[PDB]
Amino acid sequence: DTAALLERIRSDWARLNHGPSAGPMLTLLLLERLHAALGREIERTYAASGLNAAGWDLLLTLYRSAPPEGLRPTELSALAAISGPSTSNRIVRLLEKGLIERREASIRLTPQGRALVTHLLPAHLATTQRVLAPLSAQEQRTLEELAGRMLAGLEQ
Amino acid sequence: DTAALLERIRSDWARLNHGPSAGPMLTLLLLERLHAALGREIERTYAASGLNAAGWDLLLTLYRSAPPEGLRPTELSALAAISGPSTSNRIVRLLEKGLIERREASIRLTPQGRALVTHLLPAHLATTQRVLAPLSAQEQRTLEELAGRMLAGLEQ
Numbered sequence: 001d002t003a004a005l006l007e008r009i010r011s012d013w014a015r016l017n018h019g020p021s022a023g024p025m026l027t028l029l030l031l032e033r034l035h036a037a038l039g040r041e042i043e044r045t046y047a048a049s050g051l052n053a054a055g056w057d058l059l060l061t062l063y064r065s066a067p068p069e070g071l072r073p074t075e076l077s078a079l080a081a082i083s084g085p086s087t088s089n090r091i092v093r094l095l096e097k098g099l100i101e102r103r104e105a106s107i108r109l110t111p112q113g114r115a116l117v118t119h120l121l122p123a124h125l126a127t128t129q130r131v132l133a134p135l136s137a138q139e140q141r142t143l144e145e146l147a148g149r150m151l152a153g154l155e156q
Numbered sequence: 157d158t159a160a161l162l163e164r165i166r167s168d169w170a171r172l173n174h175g176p177s178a179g180p181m182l183t184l185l186l187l188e189r190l191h192a193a194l195g196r197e198i199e200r201t202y203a204a205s206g207l208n209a210a211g212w213d214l215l216l217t218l219y220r221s222a223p224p225e226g227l228r229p230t231e232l233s234a235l236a237a238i239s240g241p242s243t244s245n246r247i248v249r250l251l252e253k254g255l256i257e258r259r260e261a262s263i264r265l266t267p268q269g270r271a272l273v274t275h276l277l278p279a280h281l282a283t284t285q286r287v288l289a290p291l292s293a294q295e296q297r298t299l300e301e302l303a304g305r306m307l308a309g310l311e312q
């Protein structure tokens with residue numbers, strides 16, 4: 001794929017405007033494609049291990065944010081990046097791989113669940129870094145501020 | 157949800173750093189949550205009509221970018237915002253609702269498929285605008301530039 005047809009989409013929206021900007025529609029298109037792009041790149045570090053995005057997200061969330069006893073399914077969702085129909089069965093699934101366990105509830109990593117994340121984490125941190133490499137200091141800070149500001153507007 | 161635990165996640169990553177920035181990980185988290193937020197807001201204009209995101213995207217793509225005969229399944233994906241397992245059966249599904257049709261192939265809207273988009277479009281353009289309202293000129297332009305630049309880095 002390329003960004004060679006961005007002007008084609010822009011002019012396509014102009015035709016629709018008989019009687020004045022396509023910025024919003026193009027920005028959301030780009031954000032949508034960015035998400036998919038980021039998705040393919042991030043999964044590379046955990047695909048080989050048989051995990052999908054939703055599974056990975058839960059495990060890493062436990063790894064960085066779960067206290068020794070674990071996180072209540074509520075606070076667990078509040079601390080995870082992904083939330084939605086994608087995580088409709090992530091818990092049950094992970095329990096079945098013995099990567100997490102219960103404590104009634106309360107979820108937390110099992111010795112292997114943690115072993116896996118420890119081994120993958122270096123590769124995740126790398127991809128995470130690489131993926132944002134094209135930008136740079138302050139560019140990444142501003143992106144952070146805007147996404148936060150936009151996201152803040154919708155979280156009301 | 158709120159952005160009240162962003163510092164908690166940041167400090168959580170710091171603990172992991174025994175021996176130096178969490179920006180990348182927090183920026184991608186924010187981008188991930190932004191996508192879900194945007195997803196819930198955009199669907200409001202088409203949910204009542206029984207369409208999901210993948211169905212809507214195809215229809216709108218045809219509406220703005222399909223010439224009179226239609227788009228070849230290839231160029232159709234190149235002009236659509238969404239691409240992935242979500243659109244694994246969007247075509248077959250839409251044919252079944254009689255919103256699109258064939259031309260052997262080649263896809264295009266049917267009289268109603270177009271009627272629907274015409275009726276929804278005003279509401280979509282509104283949400284699309286609203287959702288980016290919190291920012292402003294140049295803020296939306298810069299967001300566009302960065303997402304494009306990042307996205308450009310991954311589309312290689």
Ligand SMILES: [Cl-]
Pocket residue numbers: 025029216217237
């Ligand atoms: Cl679009």
Ligand SMILES: [Cl-]
Pocket residue numbers: 060061081181185
């Ligand atoms: Cl994370």
